[PDB]
Write a protein that binds this ligand. Structure first.
Ligand SMILES: O=P(O)(O)O[C@H]1[C@H](OP(=O)(O)O)[C@@H](OP(=O)(O)O)[C@H](OP(=O)(O)O)[C@@H](OP(=O)(O)O)[C@H]1OP(=O)(O)O
Ligand SMILES: [Zn+2]
Ligand SMILES: [Zn+2]
Ligand SMILES: [Zn+2]
Lengths: 88, 45, 116, 84, 48, 241, 133, 39, 261, 292
C-alpha cells in the first residue's frame, strides 16, 4: 500500500508541473488561461481557496482595538502587491 | 396593518414537506460564554 | 356547515384520464409527483375494485367512485351489501344453470389467458 | 430534572424543557465515574479519582469536600438514610 | 486453483440429465429464452 | 414514472405488467436496476387485476358468452400460481394458492356428479373470498413498504443509520468495548503526563498479553509499572473467561 | 501569482483533510495555524486558533502560541482582551498568570500589574506565586 | 486505533427533520400501548 | 401608442403551429419523467428559433393591461405566444411608465416575474442576480448566427446595433473583432432582461442577405450576461456613477429623517 | 421548536395600504436563497384582488443578519440596496465596511446559524446609532496607435461645413462626445429640444455613437423635422477662418454639429478599436484648434 501511494503522489506532482509550465509558456505568447476547478466529487464539496473555511471570530472583548485592524489589511495588501510583481 | 395567519390544506398525494430532504449540516458553537474550570513518579510511570 | 360532495359528470373523469396519456409538457411536473404519491394507496383501490365485481347474473354494474382531480388514482367507493337468503338463492340458481349447460353442450371452449 | 457526569470531568445539570444546561459543575479534575443522590436532603454526591464532592441541587453550589485522599479510582457511590 | 473444487464434474452430470432437469413441466406464466438460441430454460439453474 | 425517475429505461414494462430487460447490462447497471420486493409485489398484484378486468372486457366485447365468463373468472382464481409470479416476492401466499386448490377439489366433485370431465364450472365465490382476505393483510404491509421506497426517492436515505450488534459483527464490537475500558482505567491512574503518545503503546501490550494467554506463555515485561500490570491482567482474565 | 495561489489552495486541502479525521492532534492545529501566519493572514490564522480551542481548551501550549502569534505581529489589544478569556478559563494554571505578567513588564506599565496581582492574591495561589509579588 | 467514537449530536443537529426521513420501521410500529401502574 | 395603445395584440403562432413538447432525437429511448432522450450520446442539441419578435407588428393591448399586470409575456419576447389578446401578460416593450411600477418587485424578480438567484452561474446563463444590477448583455455565437459567411467587423457592429435598437434604450455598443464579442449596455435592467430572452437563439442574417432560405440550420447568437469591464477608463467611470447616485440618495435619506424629526 | 417561534420580517412598503391582510404560513416551504435551508414561507396578496402573490424568499435568520425585508431584500430602516448601504456608510466612516458572501454551499450553510451580525446592519438596526450617521450625512451635504493610418476615413468626414439652414439631408455629424454620456441622453435632449416626446416608438431619429472615436452620427426621418432641429440650436461658434457649427448643450459637455449629406455606414468612424483611438487623437487636436 505505502509504496504505491508515494509513486502515485509523484505522478500527480508531475501533472501539475507539466501543466504549470504550459501556463508559464502561454503567458509568453500572451494568452492567459486560468487554472480550472478540480471538479467536485460529491454534491456539497468545498473550495478552500475561495472563502474562510470555518470562520470563528475570536471574542467580544472589552478592550476595543479598532486600530490594529487597519495595519493588518495594510500589511496584507502590501504582501499580495509584492506577489503581483516580484512573483515571490 | 394586522396579520391573519392561515395554514393551507395540502394535497395528500403530493410529497409533504416539499422542502424536506436528507442533508448534512455542520453547526457552529453555541453563543453562551465559557465557564471557568475551577480546579520520581516519572521513572515510576 | 357541511354540505355533502358534489356528484360530478362522468365525462369529467374521462377527459382528465385521456389528457394524462402523454405528459411531456412542463405543466405535468406536479401531477407526476402525485402519481408517485398514489402508489402507496394502489392496493387499497384493487381491493375495492375486486370486492365490487359483477356476479354472473348481472350484465353491467354501476359504482360510485372517488378520483383525484389530476387523475392519479380512482377508488371504488361502495360496499357490496346483500340479503343472505336472496344471495344464496341467486348463486344456487346460477349453480343449476351452470350444471345444465355443461351437460347440454358437447364441446365447451375455455378462454385464453391472458386475454390480450 | 436530569443530572449527568462524564469523562470530561464535568457534572452538568439540565433544563429539559429548554433542552439546555442549567449549570456546569467543573470542580472535578478527572473523569467522574460515580454519582448518588441523597435520599432525604435533595443533594447529589459525585466522585472523581481521590476526589469526592457533594452538591446542592437548587444552585450549582459546593456543599462539602470529603477526606478521600489516596483512595484511588472510585467505581461506585452509595448514600444511606442515616447520612452514611 | 489449488484448493477450489472443479466445476467440470457438476456440469457433466447436469448436461446428461438435462432433458429431465430442464423439462417443460408446469406453466409458470412465461418462459425464458436463451439469447442467440431457441433453448428455453424452465427454471433458474446456473450449472445448466 | 418510478422506473424512469430511477433512470432505468433499459427496463421495459409491458401492459400485462411484465418487466423485461431489453439489453445486456453492465455490472454498474445491474447493481442499479435491482428492484425490491415492494416494487415486484405491487406489479404482480396489478397483473392479477388486469387479468380479471380483461376477462370482463372480452364478454363486454361479445367475444365470450356468460358461461365462458364465469368459467374464466373461476379459472384465474385457482391458477394464480400458474399465471402470476406472486410467490417469488412474498412466499407465504402459497397458503392461499393451496387453499384455492383445496376448494377446487371439493367444488368439482359436487358439480360433476353424473357429469363428465372438461371445463364449465364457474362457481367462483369461494375462491374469490380467499383472495379478498389475502388483500386484507397485504394492504398494511405494502402501505408501509411502498411508502418507505417512495420517501427515499424524494428525500434521500438518511446518513444517521446506526447498525445493530449482529452475529457477524459481535467480535469487532467486543474489541472496541474492551479497548475503551482499558484506556479509561489506566488514564485515571496516571498523574499528568500525556494522553496521545503512550496510549497506542499501552494497547499494544494488551494485544500482546492476549497472544501470550492463548499460547500458554507467561507475559512478563521487565520495566513495566506494577499498577499498569494489574489492570492488563484483570482485563485479560475477563476476556479469557 | 497563480504559482502561489494554487499553492495556498493545495496546502489548505492537505491539512484540513487531516484535521477532518483527527480533531485531536494539537500539534497539527498549531502547524496549520503557523502556515497561515506566514501567509501574512491573521484573519485566517485566528480562526484556526479559535477552532482549536474548541477541541481542547486545557492544552495551554495552544494558548501560549496564540499569544505569541499576537505579539510577534505586535497587535497588542487582541492579546490584551484575550487574557480576559484565558485566565478566566483556567485560574489555577501558573504559566498563564506568569506570561501575562512578564509581557506587561516588557510593556512597562505597572499600573496594570497593580490590579493583576490584586486578584491573583485574592485567589490564594500558593508559595511560588506569593513570593514573586 | 479507533481512538474516539462518534458523538451522537452531530447526527442530531442534521436538518432532515426532528424525526428521521420518514422511514417507517417495523419495530417502531405501535405495541404495548397501556402502561401498568403498581398499587 | 401608435403601435401599442390603439391596437390589440395579435397571435404570433397558432396552437396547431406550436412546436412539439418532445425534443428531437438524442438517444435511443425517451425518458418520460425528465422528458429527455436516453441511452446514447447527445449531438450538440442547440438550434435556432423558427420564430422571432416583431415589436411594431405584434404589440397591442392585452387582458393583462386591463387587470393591472406588472409583468411581460416571455413567449411574446420569444415571438411564440398563442393567446394574443387573451394573455394575462403584457405584449409590448418595457417603458419608463411600466418600469416605474416595477420598482419594489424588480429587486428580486425580473421583468417576466422570475426569481433571481444569489450566485450567477458558471456560464452566466438565464436569470440574473439579486446582488448585482447588471445592465450589460454579452453577445456570442456570432459566427453561428451569421451562418458562417464572412463580413467586415464594422458591418457586424451595425447589424447588431439595429436588431437590438428596438428593444430599449441602448447605452453603448462595442463589437470586438479580436474576441468576437458584443457588449451591449442598456439604460434599464428591465430592458436588458427583455432583450436577453428576445434575441437568444436567433439569426442575424436579413431576408435579403442571400441565406434567408437556409438560416434555420444554425445555432443562433448566444446572449449571456457580461462580466466586469477590465479596462481602467470604465472602472473609473464605474467609480464616478457610484458616487453621484450615492449623493442623490444622500439627499433623500435626510429628507425622511426630516420627516421623522 | 426553533423553527416556528421567531416572527416574520415584512416592510410596510411590501405589505401595502390594506387594513387587515390574510396570509398563508407553510412550515417547510421553499429553501432560502442565501443559506439554502428549508424555512417557513409566507404568502400574501396586498389587496384581495391582486394579480400577484408576494412570497418570502429568504428566511428570518438571514434577514436579521442583514437587517433587510424578506421580500424586497432592501433595508428595513432605509429601504435601500445592500450594495448601496455599505457604500454610504463607508463615506461617513473612514473605515470601509462590506457584506461578504459565502461561495461554498456548506459554508453559506454554516454562516447563517451564527447569531452575531455582519455589514452595515450593526449600525442600521439601532435607532440611536443610525441617527448619528444620517446627521453626518448633512455635514457632507454642507461640504458640497500612431502607426495605423486613418486617412481614408478622414476624407469622408465633412470637416468644413456650416449650418447653412437649408433642407440638405436628414443626416448630420456630431463630435467632441467624450467617454461618458449614454446614447439615450443624447436622443432624449434632441427629442426634448425638437419637442417630440417618445422619440423611439415613432422611430423619427437614429443615432450612432462609437464612444472610442469620440464622434457620433445622426439620422432623421421625415426631413421637415431635420431643419426644425437646426431652428432650435441657439449656440454657435463661428470658427475664425472656418465654417460655423451648432452646439448641443448637455450638462458641462459640448457637442458640435456639421450636416453630413453623404455620411453613413459604420466603417465611417473606424473599423477596429485602435483605429478609433487614433481618430480620438486626431479630433482632440482639431477641437483645440477650433477653440484656440
Ligand atoms: O391432475 P388431475 O388428476 O388430472 O386432476 C385434474 C386437474 O386438477 P388438480 O391438478 O388441481 O387436482 C386439473 O387442473 P389443472 O391440471 O388445470 O391444474 C382440472 O382441470 P381444471 O382445473 O383446468 O378445470 C381437472 O378437472 P376437470 O378435468 O374436471 O376440468 C382435474 O381432474 P379431476 O376433475 O379428475 O380431478
Ligand atoms: Zn402572451
Ligand atoms: Zn437563510
Ligand atoms: Zn419589502
Amino acid at each position: 500500500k505505502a509504496t504505491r501511494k508515494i509513486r502515485e503522489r509523484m505522478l500527480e506532482e508531475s501533472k501539475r508541473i507539466a501543466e504549470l509550465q504550459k501556463r508559464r509558456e502561454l503567458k509568453q505568447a500572451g494568452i492567459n488561461v486560468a487554472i480550472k476547478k478540480p471538479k467536485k466529487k460529491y454534491g456539497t464539496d468545498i473550495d478552500y481557496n475561495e472563502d474562510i473555511v470555518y470562520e470563528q471570530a475570536p471574542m467580544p472583548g472589552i478592550y476595543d482595538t479598532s486600530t490594529e485592524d487597519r495595519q493588518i489589511k495594510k500589511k496584507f495588501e502590501q504582501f499580495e502587491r509584492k506577489v503581483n510583481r516580484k512573483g515571490l | 396593518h394586522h396579520i391573519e395567519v392561515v395554514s393551507k390544506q395540502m394535497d395528500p398525494l403530493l410529497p409533504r414537506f416539499v422542502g424536506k430532504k436528507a442533508r448534512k449540516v455542520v453547526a457552529p458553537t453555541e453563543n453562551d460564554e465559557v465557564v471557568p474550570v475551577l480546579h520520581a513518579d516519572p521513572n515510576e510511570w | 356547515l357541511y354540505t355533502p360532495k358534489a356528484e360530478m359528470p362522468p365525462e369529467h373523469l374521462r377527459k382528465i384520464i385521456n389528457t394524462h396519456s402523454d405528459m411531456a409538457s412542463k405543466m405535468y411536473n406536479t401531477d407526476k409527483k402525485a402519481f408517485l404519491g398514489a402508489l402507496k394507496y394502489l392496493p387499497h383501490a384493487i381491493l375495492k375494485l375486486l370486492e365490487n365485481m359483477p356476479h354472473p347474473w348481472e350484465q353491467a354494474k354501476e359504482v360510485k367512485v372517488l378520483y383525484h382531480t389530476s387523475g392519479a388514482i380512482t377508488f371504488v367507493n361502495e360496499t357490496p351489501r346483500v340479503i343472505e337468503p336472496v344471495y344464496t338463492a341467486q348463486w344456487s340458481a346460477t349453480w343449476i344453470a351452470m350444471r345444465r349447460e355443461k351437460r347440454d353442450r358437447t364441446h365447451f371452449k375455455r378462454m385464453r389467458f391472458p386475454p390480450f | 430534572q436530569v443530572v449527568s457526569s462524564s469523562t470530561d470531568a464535568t457534572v452538568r445539570l439540565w433544563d429539559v424543557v429548554a433542552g439546555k444546561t442549567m449549570k456546569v459543575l467543573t470542580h472535578h479534575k478527572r473523569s467522574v465515574r460515580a454519582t448518588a443522590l441523597h435520599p432525604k436532603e435533595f443533594s447529589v454526591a459525585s466522585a472523581c479519582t481521590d476526589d469526592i464532592r457533594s452538591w446542592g441541587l437548587a444552585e450549582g453550589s459546593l456543599l462539602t469536600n470529603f477526606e478521600s485522599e489516596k483512595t484511588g479510582i472510585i467505581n461506585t457511590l452509595s448514600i444511606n438514610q442515616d447520612d452514611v | 486453483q489449488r484448493t477450489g473444487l472443479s466445476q467440470i464434474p457438476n456440469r457433466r452430470f447436469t448436461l446428461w440429465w438435462s432433458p429431465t432437469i430442464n423439462r417443460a413441466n408446469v406453466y409458470v406464466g412465461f418462459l425464458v429464452q436463451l439469447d442467440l438460441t431457441g433453448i428455453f430454460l424452465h427454471g433458474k439453474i446456473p450449472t445448466l | 414514472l418510478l422506473i424512469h425517475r430511477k433512470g432505468l429505461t433499459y427496463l421495459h414494462l409491458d401492459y400485462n405488467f411484465n418487466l423485461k430487460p431489453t439489453k445486456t447490462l453492465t455490472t454498474k447497471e445491474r447493481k442499479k436496476s435491482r428492484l425490491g420486493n415492494s416494487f415486484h409485489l405491487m406489479r404482480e398484484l396489478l397483473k392479477m387485476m388486469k387479468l380479471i378486468v380483461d376477462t370482463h372486457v372480452q364478454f363486454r366485447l361479445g367475444n365470450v358468452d356468460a358461461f365462458q365468463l364465469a368459467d374464466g373468472i373461476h379459472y384465474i382464481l385457482n391458477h394464480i400460481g400458474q399465471l402470476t409470479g406472486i410467490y417469488r416476492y412474498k412466499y407465504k401466499v402459497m397458503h392461499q394458492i393451496r387453499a384455492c386448490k383445496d376448494l377446487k377439489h371439493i367444488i368439482y366433485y359436487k358439480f360433476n356428479k353424473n357429469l363428465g370431465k372438461g371445463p364449465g364450472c364457474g362457481f367462483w365465490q369461494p375462491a374469490w373470498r380467499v383472495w379478498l382476505n389475502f388483500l386484507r393483510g397485504t394492504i398494511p404491509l405494502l402501505e408501509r413498504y411502498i411508502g418507505n421506497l417512495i420517501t427515499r426517492q424524494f428525500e434521500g436515505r438518511s446518513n444517521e443509520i446506526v447498525k445493530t450488534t449482529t452475529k457477524q459483527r459481535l467480535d469487532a464490537y467486543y474489541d472496541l468495548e474492551l479497548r475503551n475500558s482499558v484506556m479509561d482505567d489506566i488514564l485515571e491512574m496516571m498523574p499528568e503526563s500525556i494522553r496521545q503518545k503512550k496510549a497506542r503503546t499501552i494497547l499494544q501490550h494488551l494485544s500482546e498479553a492476549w497472544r501470550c494467554w492463548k499460547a500458554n506463555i507467561p507475559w512478563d515485561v521487565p520495566g513495566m509499572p506494577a499498577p499498569i500490570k494489574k489492570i492488563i491482567e484483570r482485563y485479560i482474565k475477563s476476556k479469557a473467561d | 501569482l497563480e504559482e502561489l495561489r494554487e499553492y495556498q489552495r493545495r496546502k489548505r486541502t492537505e491539512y484540513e483533510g487531516y484535521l477532518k479525521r483527527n480533531r485531536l492532534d494539537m500539534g497539527q492545529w498549531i502547524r496549520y495555524a503557523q502556515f497561515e501566519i506566514e501567509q501574512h493572514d491573521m484573519r485566517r490564522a485566528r480562526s484556526i486558533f479559535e477552532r482549536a480551542l474548541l477541541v481542547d481548551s486545557s492544552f495551554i501550549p495552544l494558548w501560549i502560541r496564540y499569544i505569541d502569534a499576537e505579539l510577534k505581529v505586535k497587535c497588542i489589544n487582541h492579546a490584551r482582551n484575550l487574557m480576559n478569556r484565558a485566565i478566566s478559563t483556567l485560574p489555577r494554571v501558573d504559566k498563564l498568570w506568569y506570561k501575562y505578567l512578564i509581557v506587561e513588564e516588557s510593556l512597562n506599565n505597572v499600573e496594570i500589574v497593580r490590579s493583576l496581582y490584586t486578584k491573583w492574591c485574592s485567589l490564594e495561589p500558593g508559595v511560588n506565586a506569593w513570593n514573586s509579588f | 486505533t479507533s481512538h474516539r467514537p462518534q458523538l451522537e449530536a452531530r447526527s442530531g443537529a442534521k436538518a432532515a427533520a426532528y424525526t428521521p426521513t420518514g422511514i417507517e420501521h417495523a419495530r417502531l410500529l405501535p405495541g404495548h400501548t397501556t402502561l401498568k401502574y403498581r398499587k | 401608442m401608435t403601435s401599442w395603445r390603439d391596437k390589440s395584440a395579435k397571435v404570433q403562432v397558432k396552437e396547431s403551429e406550436l412546436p412539439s413538447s418532445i425534443p428531437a432525437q438524442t438517444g435511443l429511448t425517451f425518458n418520460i419523467w425528465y422528458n429527455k432522450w436516453s441511452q446514447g450520446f447527445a449531438g450538440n442539441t442547440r438550434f435556432v428559433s423558427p420564430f422571432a419578435l416583431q415589436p411594431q407588428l405584434h404589440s397591442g393591448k392585452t387582458r393583462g393591461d386591463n387587470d393591472g399586470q406588472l409583468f411581460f409575456c416571455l413567449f411574446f419576447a420569444k415571438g411564440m405566444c398563442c393567446l394574443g389578446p387573451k394573455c394575462e401578460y403584457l405584449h409590448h416593450i418595457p417603458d419608463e411608465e411600466d418600469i416605474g411600477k416595477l420598482a419594489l418587485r424588480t429587486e428580486v424578480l425580473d421583468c417576466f416575474g422570475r426569481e433571481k438567484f444569489a450566485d450567477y452561474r458558471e456560464d452566466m446563463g438565464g436569470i440574473g442576480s439579486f446582488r448585482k444590477k447588471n445592465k450589460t448583455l454579452y453577445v456570442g455565437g456570432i459566427d453561428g448566427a451569421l451562418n458562417s459567411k464572412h463580413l467586415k467587423p464594422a458591418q457586424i457592429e451595425s447589424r447588431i446595433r439595429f436588431v437590438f435598437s428596438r428593444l430599449g434604450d441602448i447605452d453603448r455598443i462595442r463589437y470586438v473583432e479580436s474576441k468576437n464579442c458584443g457588449f451591449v449596455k442598456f439604460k434599464y435592467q428591465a430592458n436588458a432582461e427583455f432583450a436577453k430572452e428576445a434575441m437568444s437563439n436567433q439569426t442575424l442574417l436579413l431576408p435579403s442577405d442571400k441565406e434567408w432560405d437556409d438560416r434555420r440550420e444554425g445555432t443562433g447568437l448566444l446572449v449571456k450576461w457580461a462580466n466586469e469591464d477590465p479596462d481602467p477608463a470604465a472602472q473609473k467611470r464605474l467609480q464616478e456613477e457610484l458616487k453621484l447616485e450615492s449623493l442623490n440618495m444622500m439627499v433623500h435619506l435626510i429628507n425622511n429623517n426630516t420627516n421623522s424629526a | 421548536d426553533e423553527i416556528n417561534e421567531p416572527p416574520p420580517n415584512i416592510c410596510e412598503q411590501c405589505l401595502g395600504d390594506e387594513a387587515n391582510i390574510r396570509m398563508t404560513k407553510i412550515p417547510q416551504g421553499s429553501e432560502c436563497k442565501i443559506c439554502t435551508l428549508p424555512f417557513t414561507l409566507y404568502h400574501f396578496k396586498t389587496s384581495k384582488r391582486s394579480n400577484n402573490i408576494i412570497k418570502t424568499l429568504i428566511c428570518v435568520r438571514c434577514a436579521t443578519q442583514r437587517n433587510i425585508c424578506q421580500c424586497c431584500m432592501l433595508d428595513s430602516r432605509w429601504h435601500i440596496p445592500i450594495q448601496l448601504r455599505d457604500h454610504l456608510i463607508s463615506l461617513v466612516n473612514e473605515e470601509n465596511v462590506m457584506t461578504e458572501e459565502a461561495k461554498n454551499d456548506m459554508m453559506k450553510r454554516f454562516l447563517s446559524l451564527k447569531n452575531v451580525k455582519l455589514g452595515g446592519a450593526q449600525i442600521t438596526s439601532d435607532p440611536s446609532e443610525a441617527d448619528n450617521i444620517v446627521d453626518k450625512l448633512k455635514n457632507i451635504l454642507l461640504r458640497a496607435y500612431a502607426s495605423v493610418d486613418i486617412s481614408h476615413i478622414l476624407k469622408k468626414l465633412p470637416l468644413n461645413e456650416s449650418f447653412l439652414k437649408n433642407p440638405s439631408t436628414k443626416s448630420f455629424f456630431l463630435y467632441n462626445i467624450d467617454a461618458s454620456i449614454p446614447e439615450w441622453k443624447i436622443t432624449d435632449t434632441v427629442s426634448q429640444l425638437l419637442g417630440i416626446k417618445k422619440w423611439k416608438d415613432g422611430n423619427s431619429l437614429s443615432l450612432i455613437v462609437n464612444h472610442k472615436a469620440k464622434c457620433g452620427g445622426l439620422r432623421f426621418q421625415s426631413s421637415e423635422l431635420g431643419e426644425r432641429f437646426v431652428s432650435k440650436i441657439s449656440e454657435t461658434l463661428v470658427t475664425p477662418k472656418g465654417l460655423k457649427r451648432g452646439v448641443l448643450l448637455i450638462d458641462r459637455f459640448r457637442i458640435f454639429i456639421i450636416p453630413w449629406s453623404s455620411g453613413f455606414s459604420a466603417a465611417s468612424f473606424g473599423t477596429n478599436t485602435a483605429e478609433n483611438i487614433k481618430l480620438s487623437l486626431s479630433l482632440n487636436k482639431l477641437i483645440q484648434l477650433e477653440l484656440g
